[PDB]
Short mmCIF file of C-alpha atoms in Angstrom, two decimals:
data_model
loop_
_atom_site.label_atom_id
_atom_site.label_comp_id
_atom_site.label_asym_id
_atom_site.label_seq_id
_atom_site.Cartn_x
_atom_site.Cartn_y
_atom_site.Cartn_z
CA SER A 1 64.20 136.67 117.63
CA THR A 2 67.88 136.43 118.56
CA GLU A 3 67.74 132.80 119.74
CA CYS A 4 65.95 131.73 116.54
CA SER A 5 68.58 133.55 114.45
CA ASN A 6 71.41 131.85 116.36
CA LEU A 7 69.79 128.46 115.77
CA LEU A 8 69.15 129.38 112.11
CA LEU A 9 72.83 130.19 111.49
CA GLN A 10 73.62 126.51 112.16
CA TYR A 11 71.53 125.48 109.13
CA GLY A 12 74.06 126.75 106.60
CA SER A 13 73.57 128.69 103.37
CA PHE A 14 70.11 127.58 102.27
CA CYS A 15 68.73 131.11 102.38
CA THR A 16 71.63 132.61 100.42
CA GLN A 17 70.89 130.29 97.51
CA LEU A 18 67.14 130.92 97.88
CA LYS A 19 67.84 134.66 97.59
CA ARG A 20 70.09 133.96 94.58
CA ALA A 21 67.32 131.97 92.86
CA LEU A 22 64.74 134.71 93.52
CA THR A 23 67.16 137.35 92.19
CA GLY A 24 67.71 135.25 89.07
CA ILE A 25 63.94 135.01 88.50
CA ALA A 26 63.64 138.78 89.06
CA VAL A 27 66.29 139.66 86.47
CA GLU A 28 64.90 137.03 84.07
CA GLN A 29 61.47 138.71 84.03
CA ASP A 30 63.01 142.03 82.97
CA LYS A 31 65.11 140.18 80.38
CA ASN A 32 61.91 138.64 78.97
CA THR A 33 60.12 142.00 78.75
CA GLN A 34 63.17 143.66 77.14
CA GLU A 35 63.50 140.80 74.64
CA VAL A 36 59.82 140.90 73.64
CA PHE A 37 59.06 144.61 73.44
CA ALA A 38 62.40 146.36 72.83
CA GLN A 39 63.21 145.13 69.33
CA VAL A 40 63.05 148.45 67.47
CA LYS A 41 66.08 150.73 67.20
CA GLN A 42 64.31 154.11 66.99
CA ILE A 43 61.02 155.47 68.33
CA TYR A 44 58.97 156.15 65.21
CA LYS A 45 56.11 158.66 65.16
CA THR A 46 53.02 158.88 62.96
CA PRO A 47 52.54 161.94 60.74
CA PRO A 48 49.68 164.12 62.02
CA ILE A 49 47.57 163.65 58.87
CA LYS A 50 45.55 160.51 59.62
CA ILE B 1 73.99 111.41 112.84
CA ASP B 2 70.29 111.37 111.92
CA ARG B 3 70.22 115.18 112.09
CA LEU B 4 73.33 115.46 109.88
CA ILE B 5 71.93 112.89 107.42
CA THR B 6 68.66 114.85 107.13
CA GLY B 7 70.55 118.10 106.45
CA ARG B 8 72.89 116.60 103.85
CA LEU B 9 70.00 114.81 102.12
CA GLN B 10 68.09 118.11 101.93
CA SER B 11 71.11 119.87 100.39
CA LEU B 12 71.61 117.08 97.82
CA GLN B 13 67.91 117.19 96.89
CA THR B 14 68.08 120.97 96.36
CA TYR B 15 71.14 120.56 94.12
CA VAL B 16 69.45 117.84 92.04
CA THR B 17 66.30 119.96 91.55
CA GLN B 18 68.34 123.00 90.46
CA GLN B 19 70.33 120.81 88.04
CA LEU B 20 67.10 119.43 86.53
CA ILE B 21 65.71 122.94 85.91
CA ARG B 22 69.01 124.12 84.39
CA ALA B 23 69.11 121.01 82.18
CA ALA B 24 65.61 121.80 80.88
CA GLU B 25 66.68 125.37 80.01
CA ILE B 26 69.87 124.10 78.32
CA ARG B 27 67.82 121.56 76.31
CA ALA B 28 65.50 124.34 75.10
CA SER B 29 68.47 126.46 73.99
CA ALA B 30 70.06 123.44 72.27
CA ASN B 31 66.83 122.77 70.34
CA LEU B 32 66.80 126.42 69.22
CA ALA B 33 70.45 126.11 68.13
CA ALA B 34 69.68 122.90 66.19
CA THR B 35 66.80 124.65 64.40
CA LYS B 36 69.12 127.56 63.54
CA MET B 37 71.70 125.08 62.23
CA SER B 38 69.14 123.34 60.02
CA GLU B 39 67.49 126.52 58.70
CA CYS B 40 70.28 129.12 58.33
CA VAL B 41 73.34 127.06 57.35
CA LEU B 42 71.74 124.26 55.30
CA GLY B 43 69.32 126.65 53.60
CA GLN B 44 68.05 130.19 53.19
CA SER B 45 65.30 131.41 55.50
CA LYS B 46 62.63 134.03 54.81
CA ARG B 47 61.81 134.56 58.50
CA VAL B 48 62.34 138.10 59.77
CA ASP B 49 65.26 138.48 62.26
CA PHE B 50 65.75 134.72 62.33
#
């Protein structure tokens, strides 16, 4: 809606900081997974004799 | 003036909530740094990668 968007532009930069907070949460989740799982330097493999 | 007061109060409330969350994260990192000061500098730790 064009009229709703023109009335929404008067409300400032609430949605820019909401998008910034959601982007921060999104990069923080990948940071958490990288910090937990990726702690080894090389990808080791088991010898085939079990 | 009531409309402007409602908008400015909403913005101030959002800033205070974001500051509270950031203060909690900073407090957690400061507690980790205090533990690292007590365990690595004032002694010798056997914990792996700590």
